Amino acid sequence: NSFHFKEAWKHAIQKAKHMPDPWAEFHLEDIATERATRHRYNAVTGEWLDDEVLIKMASQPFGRGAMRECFRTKKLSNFQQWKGASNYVAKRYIEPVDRDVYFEDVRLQMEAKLWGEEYNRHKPPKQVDIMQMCIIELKDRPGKPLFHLEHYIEGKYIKYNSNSGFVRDDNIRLTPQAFSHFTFERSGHQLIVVDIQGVGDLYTDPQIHTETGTDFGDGNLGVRGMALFFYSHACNRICESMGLAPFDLSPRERDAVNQNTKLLQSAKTILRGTEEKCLPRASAVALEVQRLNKSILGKVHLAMVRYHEGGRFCEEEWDQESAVFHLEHAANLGELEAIVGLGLMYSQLPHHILADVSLKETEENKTKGFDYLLKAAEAGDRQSMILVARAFDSGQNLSPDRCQDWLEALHWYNTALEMDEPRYMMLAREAEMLFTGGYGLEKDPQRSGDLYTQAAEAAMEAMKGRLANQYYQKAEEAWAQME
Amino acid sequence: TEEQIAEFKEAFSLFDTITTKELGTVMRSLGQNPTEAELQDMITIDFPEFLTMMARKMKDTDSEEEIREAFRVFDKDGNGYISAAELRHVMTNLGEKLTDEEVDEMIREADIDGDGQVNYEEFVQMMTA
Numbered sequence: 339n340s341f342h343f344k345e346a347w348k349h350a351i352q353k354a355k356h357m358p359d360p361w362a363e364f365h366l367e368d369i370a371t372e373r374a375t376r377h378r379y380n381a382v383t384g385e386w387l388d389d390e391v392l393i394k395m396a397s398q399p400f401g402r403g404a405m406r407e408c409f410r411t412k413k414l415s416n417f418q419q420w421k422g423a424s425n426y427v428a429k430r431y432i433e434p435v436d437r438d439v440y441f442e443d444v445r446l447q448m449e450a451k452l453w454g455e456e457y458n459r460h461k462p463p464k465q466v467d468i469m470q471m472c473i474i475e476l477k478d479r480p481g482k483p484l485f486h487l488e489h490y491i492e493g494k495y496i497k498y499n500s501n502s503g504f505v506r507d508d509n510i511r512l513t514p515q516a517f518s519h520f521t522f523e524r525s526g527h528q529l530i531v532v533d534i535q536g537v538g539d540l541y542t543d544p545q546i547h548t549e550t551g552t553d554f555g556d557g558n559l560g561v562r563g564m565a566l567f568f569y570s571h572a573c574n575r576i577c578e579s580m581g582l583a584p585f586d587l588s589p590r591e592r593d594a595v596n597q598n599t600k601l602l603q604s605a606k607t608i609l610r611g612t613e614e615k616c617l618p619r620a621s622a623v624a625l626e627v628q629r630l631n632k633s634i635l636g637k638v639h640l641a642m643v644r645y646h647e648g649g650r651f652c653e654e655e656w657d658q659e660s661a662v663f664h665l666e667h668a669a670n671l672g673e674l675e676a677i678v679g680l681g682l683m684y685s686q687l688p689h690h691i692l693a694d695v696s697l698k699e700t701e702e703n704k705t706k707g708f709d710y711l712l713k714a715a716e717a718g719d720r721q722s723m724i725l726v727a728r729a730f731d732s733g734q735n736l737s738p739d740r741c742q743d744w745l746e747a748l749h750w751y752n753t754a755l756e757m758d759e760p761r762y763m764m765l766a767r768e769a770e771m772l773f774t775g776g777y778g779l780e781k782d783p784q785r786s787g788d789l790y791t792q793a794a795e796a797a798m799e800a801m802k803g804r805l806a807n808q809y810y811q812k813a814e815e816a817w818a819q820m821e
Numbered sequence: 822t823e824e825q826i827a828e829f830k831e832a833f834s835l836f837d838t839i840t841t842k843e844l845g846t847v848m849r850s851l852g853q854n855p856t857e858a859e860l861q862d863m864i865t866i867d868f869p870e871f872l873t874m875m876a877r878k879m880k881d882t883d884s885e886e887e888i889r890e891a892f893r894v895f896d897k898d899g900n901g902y903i904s905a906a907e908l909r910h911v912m913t914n915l916g917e918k919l920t921d922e923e924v925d926e927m928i929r930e931a932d933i934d935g936d937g938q939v940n941y942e943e944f945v946q947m948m949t950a
C-alpha cells in the first residue's frame with residue numbers, strides 16, 4: 339500500500355528465520371527451568387511493573403568485569419519452544435550490594451534511553467537507542483538474588499567513551515560524543531550521559547553525571563564527570579548541526595583536543611541537512627554569562643581546576659596555566675571559591691585552591707585582586723570581608739586606584755562580626771579607629787567606648803579576662819574625652 | 822492439515838451430530854477453551870463446516886504468532902517499540918543493503934503516531950495490508 343519497504347521488512351523476516359541461534363552450542367534449553375519475578379521500570383511514569391517469568395540460566399558465568407559477572411540466560415515470552423526462546427545476558431554484582439542498587443541501575447539505563455529518544459527527535463544523522471534493562475529476582479534461590487537482564491546483541495562491542503574522560507580515537511565515531519554533549523546541553527547542564535558503549539548505536543550500561551551527584555549510583559561523578567568529559571571532548575559536525583556550544587577549553591587543551599581533527603574530518607558519519615537545533619543551556623562561558631545576567635558550568639570549570647591540580651590530566655608537569663584559565667572562567671560564572679582564590683592570587687596572597695601557583699605581580703593584577711576580594715566580600719565570604727576591611731583600614735592589599743576609607747573599613751569589619759583572628763580583636767580595632775578617627779571617619783568617643791566594651795565582653799567569652807580588663811579600661815578612656 | 826483433520830474428526834464424532842453446547846464440548850475436548858464470545862460468534866454445525874471453522878481459527882492464530890515473531894526480530898530490546906537504531910542494526914546483521922536514510926524511511930512509513938518508533942499495532946498494520 340503506502341509502504342514501499344514491505345519487501346524489505348519481509349526479506350529481513352525470512353533471512354532471520356534462516357539465521358541460527360548464536361547460543362545454540364551452550365544448550366541453555368537443557369538447564370533446569372527457574373522461576374523469577376521480572377521488575378521493569380517506566381521512566382516517564384516512574385512506575386514499576388513486576389510480573390512472573392520462567393528463565394533458564396547458565397550455572398557458570400561467561401564473563402566477569404571488575405564489578406559484575408554475566409550469565410547466559412534464555413527467557414520464555416509470556417506473549418513456547420525453549421529452543422527459540424530469546425537470549426539475555428543476566429548480570430550480577432560480584433560483591434554483595436544493597437538491593438536498591440539494581441533498581442537504581444535500571445532507572446539510570448531507562449533515563450538514558452529517554453535521552454536517546456530525545457536526541458533522535460532532533461533528526462540526527464544516525465539515531466541511537468539505549469537497550470532496555472530490567473531486573474529478575476530468583477526468589478526460589480537462597481537469598482532471593484537479583485540480576486540485571488538485557489537482550490543479547492550480536493555484533494562488535496565498543497566503548498566509545500567512559501564515565502571518566504576516555505574517548506575512542508581509533509576510527510572515531512561522531513554520534514556517541516555528539517549524544518553525550520547533546521544530553522549536557524539539552525538537560526540545561528543538569529546531567530550528561532556518558533559511558534557510551536554497545537554494538538553500533540545500540541547502547542548499554544551508560545552512566546549519567548548529575549549536578550547533585552547523588553543519583554544513578556557510584557558512577558555519578560557529578561560536575562567532576564562533566565569536566566572529565568569536556569576535557570577530552572572535540573565537538574564534531576553533529577554538535578554544530580544541533581547548536582551545541584563548545585566547552586571553553588584552554589588554548590593548550592584545545593590543541594590537544596584538535597590533535598584528532600583530521601580524524602574527525604575523515605570520519606564516516608556525514609550530516610544530512612535535516613538536523614535540528616537543541617530547557618536547554620549553552621556550554622560556553624559567554625552565553626552562560628549572559629544567562630546569569632548558581633551556574634553548573636562554572637562548577638565544571640572549577641572541577642577542571644582541581645583535576646589539573648590533582649594531576650588527573652597530567653601527561654611532564656601539570657598545566658597550571660589551564661588551571662588558572664578555568665579558575666577565571668569559574669570566577670566569571672560566579673563560583674565564590676574561584677573569586678576568592680583569584681582575589682588572593684592576584685593580590686599575591688596565600689590561597690587554598692591552586693596553592694602552589696603564584697601569579698606575576700602587576701599593578702593591573704593588584705586592581706584585579708582587590709576587585710575580586712570585594713566581590714567575594716559582597717557575596718558573603720568572611721575571609722574576603724576581613725581582607726577588604728584591612729585594606730580600607732591600613733591600605734594592605736588595597737587597590738592603588740582606591741583610597742583608605744575607615745568608613746568602608748568599619749562597614750566590612752562589622753559585616754564580618756555580624757556573620758582566624760578573634761572577634762574581640764576586630765571590635766577593638768573598630769574601637770581604636772573611632773577613638774582617633776581618620777581616613778574619612780570622624781572621632782566618636784561614645785561609640786569607641788561602646789565597641790571597647792563589646793570587645794571586653796567578647797574577651798570574657800574567650801577567657802581572655804585580663805584582655806577584657808584592658809578593653810574596659812580603654813572604653814573608660816574613650817568616654818573620658820566626652821565632657 | 823491431514824492427520825490433524827483425523828484428530829478433529831474423532832473429536833467431533835465423540836459428540837455424534839453437534840450443537841452449540843456440543844461445539845464448546847468438542848473445542849474443549851480438543852484442548853481449546855472457547856469463550857462464550859467465540860460460541861455466540863459462530864452462533865447447528867456439521868463436520869465439514871466444523872473443519873472449515875477450525876481451519877480459519879488455526880490460520881488466524883498462526884498469522885498472529887508469525888507477526889509476533891517478526892516483531893521480535895526487530896524489537897531488539899523487547900521494550901515494545903522498534904527504534905530506528907534497532908532496525909538499522911537488524912538490517913545490517915541480516916545483510917541488507919539499506920542506507921540509514923532508508924531505515925529512517927522504513928520507520929517513518931509505519932510510524933502512524935509519529936514518535937519515531939514502530940509499536941506492534943503499527944507493525945501489524947504494515948504487515949496486514
Ligand SMILES: [Ca+2]
Pocket residue numbers: 895896897898899900901902903904907
Ligand atoms: Ca525496542
Ligand SMILES: [Ca+2]
Pocket residue numbers: 931932933934935936937938939940943
Ligand atoms: Ca509509532
Ligand SMILES: [Zn+2]
Pocket residue numbers: 515516519571572573574577582584
Ligand atoms: Zn560537542
